[PDB]
Amino acid sequence: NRTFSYTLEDHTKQAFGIMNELRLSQQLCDVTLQVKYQDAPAAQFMAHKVVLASSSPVFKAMFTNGLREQGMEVVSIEGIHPKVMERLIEFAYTASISMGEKWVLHVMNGAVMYQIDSVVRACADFLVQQL
Amino acid sequence: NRTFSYTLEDHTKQAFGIMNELRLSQQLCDVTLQVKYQDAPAAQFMAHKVVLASSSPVFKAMFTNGLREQGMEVVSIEGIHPKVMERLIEFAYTASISMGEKWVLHVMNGAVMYQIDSVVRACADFLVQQL
């Protein structure tokens, strides 16, 4: 004759870890990102639409279009370097971006592009620190 | 000429919140769970295979079968009460189970069934506390 709450704090961190494994194993993926940019060679990025939607309101609006795709959607991406997209996907799955000093401005360009608010601030705060 | 890490701690909590909204709005869903149990009326549960996979190694093994389903898979579920499955899905998306005292044993039955390790322990520790 009572109500009982249990909350595992570490759950989301653990679940995103298994979600990262599935992406790396190319399991349960429904989006492929074909990233072409200037003279850099073309790259493919398999992911889960929901994980991308949860980290990017730009990706959220992109995949929520009513008439659901039967399986795998291919997406063309231009203006973002493939290394930048790789780090933004990694952020979406791991909660962390590690980046070379020379990449920060290009990372923020794609962060603004995909409205990844938190990494826009992280890059902007870093650039001001370099004076 | 340096490497720079940024880590947003709250990211996974925030992303699971948007992931919960999408489930409740029935957006980007790829699994429906038709839960039938004894004399209880039948229920449908729309979810994302990856979120279910990340919280349950039983669901992970269920959906990782090579030949990917073109869109929406319907799953028949028996032996688990629909209120129990509702709370296990909610745990998978929110990291929390709130349950009536009279439900704990039935919750653990489904928690064992879907190998949700953390909620098995939470129920088992609760039942021992009631002597």
From Swiss-Prot, chains A, B:
It is found in: Cytoplasm; Nucleus. The modification S-(2-succinyl)cysteine is found at W103. There is a cross-link at R87 (N5-[4-(S-L-cysteinyl)-5-methyl-1H-imidazol-2-yl]-L-ornithine (Arg-Cys) (interchain with C-151 in KEAP1)). There is a cross-link at W103 (N5-[4-(S-L-cysteinyl)-5-methyl-1H-imidazol-2-yl]-L-ornithine (Cys-Arg) (interchain with R-135 in KEAP1)). GO terms for biological process: cellular response to interleukin-4; cellular response to oxidative stress; in utero embryonic development; negative regulation of response to oxidative stress; negative regulation of transcription by RNA polymerase II; positive regulation of proteasomal ubiquitin-dependent protein catabolic process; proteasome-mediated ubiquitin-dependent protein catabolic process; protein ubiquitination. Keywords: Cytoplasm, Host-virus interaction, Kelch repeat, Nucleus, Repeat, S-nitrosylation, Ubl conjugation, Ubl conjugation pathway. The modification S-nitrosocysteine is found at W103. The modification S-(2,3-dicarboxypropyl)cysteine is found at W103. The record marks W103 as: Sensor for electrophilic agents. Broadly expressed, with highest levels in skeletal muscle. Non-enzymatic covalent modifications of reactive cysteines by electrophile metabolites inactivate the BCR(KEAP1) complex. Accumulation of fumarate promotes the formation of cysteine S-succination (S-(2-succinyl)cysteine), leading to inactivate the BCR(KEAP1) complex and promote NFE2L2/NRF2 nuclear accumulation and activation. Nitric oxide-dependent 8-Nitro-cGMP formation promotes cysteine guanylation (S-cGMP-cysteine), leading to NFE2L2/NRF2 nuclear accumulation and activation. Residues 29-101 form the BTB domain. Substrate-specific adapter of a BCR (BTB-CUL3-RBX1) E3 ubiquitin ligase complex that regulates the response to oxidative stress by targeting NFE2L2/NRF2 for ubiquitination. KEAP1 acts as a key sensor of oxidative and electrophilic stress: in normal conditions, the BCR(KEAP1) complex mediates ubiquitination and degradation of NFE2L2/NRF2, a transcription factor regulating expression of many cytoprotective genes. KEAP1 contains reactive cysteine residues that act as sensors for endogenously produced and exogenously encountered small molecules, which react with sulfhydryl groups and modify the cysteine sensors, leading to impair ability of the BCR(KEAP1) complex to ubiquitinate target proteins. The Kelch repeats mediate interaction with NFE2L2/NRF2, BPTF and PGAM5. This is Kelch-like ECH-associated protein 1. It comes from Homo sapiens. The chain holds residues 49 to 179 of 624 of the full protein.
